[PDB]
Each structure stands twice: as structure tokens, then as C-alpha cells.
């Protein structure tokens, strides 16, 4: 039932993520509150966030809360991938541990354009330049993500493609410390098989789109490797930037 493995994964994607590509493009076309300077950030915090430090530290805390929620949605999505709930609980944990941020930065592309990113459930839009304006090390977090996203978005994927791509990212048989490698590789084989057939049908004019996407998965691995290095730096050198517990679990010992 290949056409139904795809549909099951797509359905699980639409069920579990608040933000997706069709919703983001509707908003990014035609109004989110633009955050482009310190004044608008403060106004946005008044109107979009309920409950005092440097601007950069407040942005970092809001971002963490968001990542905590995305990690939670991705866990629910993962449990809905055929076979995943059958793996060993340790392997489930290992697959999400290394997979979530690859998935998060793929999906972040959906809400990014070259000028900024849609944030807060579609209700704000932060300019890329404002984020560059922040002081080090916080002006370094988002930029490499915009760079990745501009290359990713040029592939013109839709949510049916992205759902399978994210499933393939999560079902990766070469993560450090997997116990039952063969069981994961067999799952991934089927997802990737369905992804190749789905792209062939959904994008019949890009004959290299499947290997283009495999390469993006390796690009996202490097992107997360570097991201985890910037986070480790932040966690040493910034007194006010402690990680939410679930995020500490995920980053501890990562790369």
C-alpha cells in the first residue's frame, strides 16, 4: 500500500503540526505584525507573549519555548509513522534526539522568505536584518538557517513532499547508538521508496529532485552539527540562557 503509506504520513503531518507550508504561503502573500527594530519587538512582546532582560535573551527564551512545542509535535508525528512505535524505546529516543532539529530546520524553511520569518502561529514576521542586528552570539543562530531555507525553498516542495521528507529524516539508520540498526534501515528503505515515487509523480519536471533531496538531508545534518556547537557556546558563555529541560535532554551529548 505505497500510496497509503504516503497518505498516512501526510495525514499525520497535517494532524500534528500547527504551521505548514500552505498556511504560511497564504499569510506571506496577502497581516502579521512586523518585528524589524527594538520598538516593534517590545510591542510584539506586549501583544503576542504573556509574561525584562536584554532583547537577545528574551528572544532566545521565546525561541526555546517554541522549540519545546515543535519537539513535542515531532514526537507525535514520529509515533504515527508506520513501524516507529514498534521499535525499541531507546531507539525511538535516539532517532528523535538526532532527528528533531534536522526536521525543525527543514520545516522552518516553509515560514521563511529572503526578508524574514513568519513567527508566533502566523501572527508576527521577524525580519532577517533585525536578527542580524542582534549582538553576538545571537545574531549567528538564525542566519545559516535562512541560507539553507533559500536553497531548500527553491525546490518548490509542498506539504505532501515535506511530510515524507521529515519522515525519512527521522527514520535514519546511522544515528549514534542505535541498537536495532536493521529494523530502522528497513523502515527508512520503505519511506524513501515512497518518497522517490511520490516526487516522480508530484514533480514530473525535475528529474533530479530525489537525489537533490537526499543531498539536503546531509546538508541538514551538517547544519544541526554546527547549530549544536553554537548552542554549546551559548550555554557556557551566557548566564541568562539556560535550556528548557526537554531541550537539555536533546542537546546533551549530541555532537
Amino acid at each position: 500500500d505505497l500510496k497509503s503509506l504516503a497518505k498516512r504520513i501526510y495525514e499525520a503531518y497535517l494532524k500534528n503540526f500547527n504551521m505548514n507550508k500552505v498556511k504560511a504561503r497564504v499569510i506571506l502573500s496577502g497581516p502579521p505584525f512586523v518585528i524589524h527594530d527594538m520598538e516593534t519587538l517590545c510591542m510584539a512582546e506586549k501583544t503576542l507573549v504573556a509574561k525584562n532582560k536584554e532583547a537577545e535573551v528574551r528572544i532566545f527564551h521565546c525561541c526555546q519555548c517554541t522549540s519545546v512545542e515543535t519537539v513535542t509535535e515531532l514526537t507525535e508525528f514520529a509515533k504515527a509513522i508506520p513501524g516507529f512505535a514498534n521499535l525499541d524505546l531507546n531507539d525511538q529516543v535516539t532517532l528523535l534526539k538526532y532527528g528533531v532539529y534536522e526536521a525543525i530546520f527543514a520545516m522552518l524553511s516553509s515560514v521563511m522568505n529572503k526578508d524574514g520569518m513568519l513567527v508566533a502561529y502566523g501572527n508576527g514576521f521577524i525580519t532577517r536584518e533585525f536578527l542580524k542586528s542582534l549582538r553576538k552570539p545571537f545574531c549567528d543562530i538564525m542566519e545559516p538557517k535562512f541560507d539553507f531555507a533559500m536553497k531548500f525553498n527553491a525546490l518548490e516542495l509542498d506539504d505532501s513532499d515535506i511530510s515524507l521528507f521529515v519522515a525519512a529524516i527521522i527514520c535514519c539508520g546511522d544515528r549514534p547508538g542505535l541498537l536495532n540498526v536493521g529494523h530502522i534501515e528497513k523502515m527508512q528503505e520503505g519511506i524513501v521508496h515512497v518518497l522517490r515515487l511520490h516526487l516522480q509523480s508530484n514533480h514530473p519536471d525535475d528529474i533530479f529532485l530525489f537525489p537533490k533531496l537526499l543531498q539536503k538531508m546531509a546538508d541538514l545534518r551538517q547544519l544541526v552539527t554546527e547549530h549544536a556547537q553554537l548552542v554549546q557556546i551559548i550555554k557556557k558563555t551566557e548566564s541568562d540562557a539556560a535550556l528548557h529541560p526537554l531541550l537539555q535532554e536533546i542537546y546533551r551529548d549530541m555532537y
Binding site: 519537539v71 514526537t75 524505546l89 529516543v93 528523535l96 534526539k97 535532554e249 536533546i250
Partner: peptide, 11 residues
């Protein structure tokens, strides 16, 4: 070692 995530997974 991944207490919260393990909790999430078993729900």
C-alpha cells in the same frame, strides 16, 4: 537519561 522524551513516547 532522556526522561521527558521517554515520557512523551510512551503516551
Amino acid at each position: 537519561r532522556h526522561k521527558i522524551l521517554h515520557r512523551l513516547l510512551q503516551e
